[PDB]
Amino acid sequence: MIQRTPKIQVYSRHPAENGKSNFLNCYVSGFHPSDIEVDLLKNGERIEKVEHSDLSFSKDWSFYLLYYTEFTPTEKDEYACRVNHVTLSQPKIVKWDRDM
């Protein structure tokens, strides 16, 4: 069975502004099978009560999901998305970069 590894993007809903409420997004797409584990991290630790979209798929049948949480970015705080999937030998961590 052909498996496809997830593409991962981590970004904010609005342009990032220190001290201003915002949304942190982790968008996972292009993957198969659909079983996937996604955590959003604040300074290496898991953020609680993170919401996600209902499973759907692209025209090529590959799956996508959006994981999201309200957050207030600061100069000090580091954010990331941690993703595990059958295609990954270990969890893939993608750091949030306000420039991307």
């Binding site: 949304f23 968008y27 590959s62 991307m100």
Partner: protein
């Protein structure tokens, strides 16, 4: 303009962990409007857009019943597929189906769709004629023979040309505030030094709807197609989308580069420059 309605369905088996999980969602263009999850507290089809919330109790009962029927049919079909592919009962398997319709500016059917995938690959698809089938393999041929005998294509054609289109037009009118509003990208260019010799120019497009967009970089009016990094268009979470396009430029030559932005919400296409 042109519009689409799609229903997406995914069943995933989980041997030894109860029955398959079923999730289905409906979309008009890039807008999620309904969802059903078999694992939900008490499974109902639920509204996900404000313009569908006005549909009465009978709409929601029927949709919910259709979803429940589909979940059960999917359970049987997963068992059938194990047989067709001589597979053990040990593994988790995926069954996907999409159907829907595209309409033009006039509200007439452009194209109807109905197709299935098993474990991520094409299984069977209804052809554009809404009368003939494409089976991916000898297993799918068994379904094809069954569906030809039961005249399923005719039943799908009737819906796709009829109710699919009619309800789409209704949804477009009821949701005209949002579904027929194109929000333009908010655009800006950022500069990211790499070394003393070069830098990345990144052209941003934020807050746009629908997702369709063109972002390209030019140098002296010549498209930098091969040299551009383009992220996948990504959802902001507020119905809008984001995208950026980047090029590596020799330091001091920034003003030779123009980012070009095409989107339906724009009065006119944009030509952006790095502005320090």
């Amino acid at each position: 303009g042109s519009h689409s309605m799609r229903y997406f369905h995914t069943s995933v088996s989980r041997p030894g962990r109860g029955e398959p999980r079923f999730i289905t969602v409906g979309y008009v263009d890039d807008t999620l409007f309904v969802r059903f999850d078999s694992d939900a507290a008490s499974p109902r089809e639920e509204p996900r857009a404000p313009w569908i919330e006005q549909e009465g109790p009978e709409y929601w009962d029927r949709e919910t019943q259709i979803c429940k029927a589909k979940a059960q049919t999917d359970r049987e079909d997963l068992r059938t597929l194990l047989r067709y592919y001589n597979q053990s009962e040990a593994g988790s398997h995926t069954l996907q189906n999409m159907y829907g319709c595209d309409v033009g500016p006039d509200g007439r059917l452009l194209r109807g769709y109905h197709q299935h995938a098993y474990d991520g690959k094409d299984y069977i698809a209804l052809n554009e004629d809404l009368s003939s089938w494409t089976a991916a393999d000898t297993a799918a041929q068994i379904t094809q023979r069954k569906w030809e005998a039961a005249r399923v294509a005719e039943q799908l054609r009737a819906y796709l040309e009829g109710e699919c289109v009619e309800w789409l037009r209704r949804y477009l009118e009821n949701g005209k505030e949002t579904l027929q509003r194109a929000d333009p990208p908010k655009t800006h260019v950022t500069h990211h030094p790499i070394s003393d010799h070069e830098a990345t120019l990144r052209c941003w497009a934020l807050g746009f709807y629908p997702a369709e967009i063109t972002l390209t970089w030019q140098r002296d009016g010549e498209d930098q197609t091969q040299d551009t990094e383009l992220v996948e268009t990504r959802p902001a979470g507020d119905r809008t989308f984001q995208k950026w396009a980047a090029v590596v430029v020799p330091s001091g030559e920034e003003q030779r580069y123009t980012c070009h932005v095409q989107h339906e919400g724009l009065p006119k296409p944009l030509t952006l420059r790095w502005e320090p």
